[model samples]
Target: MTEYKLVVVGAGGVGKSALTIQLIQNHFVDEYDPTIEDSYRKQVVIDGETCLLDILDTAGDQYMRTGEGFLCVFAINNTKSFEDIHQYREQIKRVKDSDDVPMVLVGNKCDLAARTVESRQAQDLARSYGIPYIETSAKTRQGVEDAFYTLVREIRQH
Candidate 1:
């Protein structure tokens, strides 16, 4: 079997941990450790292929440059987090040294009452970049799997 190396990235407190764990363990949490990195693996079939999904919940960028695909996550209820998406995306493009990177722009925390980053806003940004955009709620486990799973497909297509 083959494997897809995926990197999860976002501004602090944007629920990257929650989303990642939800997909891997069917659980959610609020946590981040800058000095430590957590990794996970799962075997799944997508479309017609069975492959292992390897994920690095970006406490560091060791895998950023070499990672095959990326999940650029942000918070729907956070203006600051949404604003930080540009920085992270640019960083990845810079490090990867190319415009052709397999990436998905994710709006996490959709299960919240407060909304700052509107769906239209995120969609426009992603549209301009010509990448896929997904809305997710790590708390409710909404679209969590799709966010990461889409990254795998993006990598295969790119």
Candidate 2:
């Protein structure tokens, strides 16, 4: 089986930690730093293929290179979180030295509150980047796995 290096990044308090912890503990499965939020792994079957994923859930505290894909997360209720998405995306692209990095634009906290970032707005931004946009709620466990699975698939197809 192949192993993928995946990453979750965004502005603070957008549920990057919750999403990472949710996926790891629920599916199967860390590093050392608080800023790093530990590295995690999981064995999952994506599109009938078994793969291991090493995920870095970060506050964007430090730029992490060597990622096969990224989940660029933001809270739907926070416009600043949404705005930071572009910066994170661009950083990952430059850090990885490629424009076609496997990234899923994640709108987290789908089940919690009213939306400050409109659905169409998120979709349009994702479309402009030619990437997939998914809604997730770590509290409800919605799309937690799908986001990771889709990102892995993104690397697989690339």
Candidate 3:
């Protein structure tokens, strides 16, 4: 099986956990209860491609410093999630080693487009960081596979 590490980082309550869960299980939690949890993981196969999505679903909402030396970032635009993405810029900039790593900009919850931050604005931030940007809606499964597969393709190509 072709394997890789996918890291997701974003602001609080932006549906990070929901997206992760939805992508794997193809179901949504009607009522999400956030108990103190370390992390949640699931292996998924999409359109004949396989991946292990490791979501560092933390309550801290701080910079996710990985144990291994690789650092990658993905964000959601739901409920102003992009606004909080700036908090992670510093952590990414301060990488002691591995100056260049894969990163992606994701706008989740597109079904709530009325409430999302401007997609162009979010793409601008991602472009500045030299990452690909995409809008995904787990509710409708729009761009859900595309978002992950696009990043995986970039990773494999690089």
Candidate 4:
């Protein structure tokens, strides 16, 4: 079984954990509450291939806004998280040492973006960070495969 380490980080209440659950099990967390734990990882299999996605679902708002960790950080949620995103330099700097590994910026919550975050804002932030970005909707499964597949393809290439 081939395995790869993937990390998911974002501001608290941005649906990082929910996205993790939906990616692994196709379930969304309703009435979700903040995770008390510091970090958690989950394993998932796609196309008969198994990989471990070790997610650091940043719990403390301050930690996510300020902390850094290894592996790729894909921010989830758009509407509530922050449509108008800011530079997460510290987070990026922590993992910038990995040449082969690439980081992806995600502007999640596409299913409801009409009522929230402007697509332009999301794009500009990604462009400034020099990272590939895509909007996702865990609820509708939009860009879900792309999100996972993008990482899988990168892992294979590396």
Candidate 5:
């Protein structure tokens, strides 16, 4: 099976762990403990092909700088978190040394009614970067699978 390393990145309290845990175990944690870098491995079948996914959930520190792909996430209610993706993308390019790295910009917390970042704006930003944009809600488990599947597909294509 092909193994892919997926970096989960975003600002603190942006639901990075929530999305990762939801995708891996199908459980969402209501409490936030502030992640200090955690790795989760799972065998997922995408498009009928089985592959291993090693997901690195990052806090505000530490990352597998040479990962195959990245899911740069931000909470929809926090626009400041959304603003940080430009720097994150730059860092990813610098570390990976590729302009067309496999990446997805994720807007989390879509279940909340009060959102500061609209989906259109997020999608536009992602389009500017030539990456896929997805919205996920860990609380309700909406679009959680789609986000991972999308990134996996991008990785496969790349």
Candidate 6:
């Protein structure tokens, strides 16, 4: 059986839990408890292969933060959250000690009316890191699965 360890990291109130919930449970949450960690396990079929996806939804607070892949998320409406993604990427690379770390830069909250950072800007930033950028809405469940599946595929390739 193939297993992938994925971590989701983002600033507070950026909808990390929302994405996870939408991906794993197919549910949209208007309110989530911030003080708790949300983890999920599921059998997902990607590229005609079934594998186990073990997700840890949290900030960069893991004690022994070793993982095969990571999802660095930010809100499209919050430019500050987008700025923080650089630090998250740097930390992951430092911990993994590799520039070719398997990751995806995700811009969440796509359903909102106010967006500070444009998609092209995010795509360019992700391209500089040699990774894919995905925009997702946890409320509408748009592109949530794609982000997770793409990260898993990238990890498998690495």
Q: Pick the candidate with the highest TM-score.
A: 5
lDDT of 4 by residue, 1-158 (tens): 65555556566656667766777778877766887654545566766777665555544233333222222223343354553233344544444533333556676666763545566766676677555667677787778667756756655655
How far residue 5's Cα lies from its native spot in candidate 1, in Å, is 0.4
TM-score of 1: 0.92
In terms of TM-score, which candidate is stronger, 1 or 2? 1
lDDT of 2 by residue, 89-118 (tens): 878878888888888999998986778999
158 Cα displacement, candidate 4 (Å): 5.5
Clashes (N, CA, C under 3 Å) per candidate: 0, 1, 0, 0, 0, 0
Runs in model 5 deviating more than 4 A are 61-63
Q: How big is the positional error of residue 27 in model 6, measured in Å on the Cα after superposition?
A: 0.4
In model 6, which runs have C-alpha deviations exceeding 4 angstroms? 60-64
Q: On a 0 to 100 scale, what is the lDDT of residue 22 in model 5?
A: 92
Candidate 4 to truth, TM: 0.67
Model 1, span 1-158: residue lDDT tens: 99898888888778877788889898777665553567889998888889898888875244666688889888898898888788888888887888889999999889898998899999999998889999999878888878887888888887
The superposed Cα distance between candidate 5 and the true structure at residue 136, in angstroms, equals: 0.1
TM-score for each predicted model, relative to the true structure: 0.92, 0.90, 0.73, 0.67, 0.95, 0.93
In candidate 3, how many clashes are counted? 0
What do the candidate models score in CA lDDT, each in turn?
0.84, 0.84, 0.60, 0.56, 0.89, 0.87
What lDDT tens digits, residue by residue, belong to model 3 across residues 47-113?
Answer: 5777665555444123355522122223444444566676655555564244456666778777773
In candidate 2, how many Å is residue 62 off? 7.5
Cα lDDT tens digits, model 6, 20-50, are 9889999998985783665789998888898
RMSD of 5: 1.3
